[PDB]
Amino acid sequence: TLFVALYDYESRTETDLSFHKGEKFQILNSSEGDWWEARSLTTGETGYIPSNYVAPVD
Ligand code: NA
Ligand code: NA
Numbered sequence: 001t002l003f004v005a006l007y008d009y010e011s012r013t014e015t016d017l018s019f020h021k022g023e024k025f026q027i028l029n030s031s032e033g034d035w036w037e038a039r040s041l042t043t044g045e046t047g048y049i050p051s052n053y054v055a056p057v058d
Contacts (some may be wrong), residue, residue, distance in 0.1 A: 002041070003027060003054035017047030024057065025049060 003025045011018040019025075019037065025038040028046065035048045 002057045
């Protein structure tokens, strides 16, 4: 399942990933907690994203 960003997000450190609304992600690990390691389909950049900022793609 790919996920899509609901809102813009400005990351705090190098651990979490900044992204824009509408960006899509491949999820790498979602079972450390509610922050998921993810890869942007736009940039291929990876980092943690807040799961409450994404939804599964149509
Ligand atoms: Na960051
Ligand atoms: Na969500």
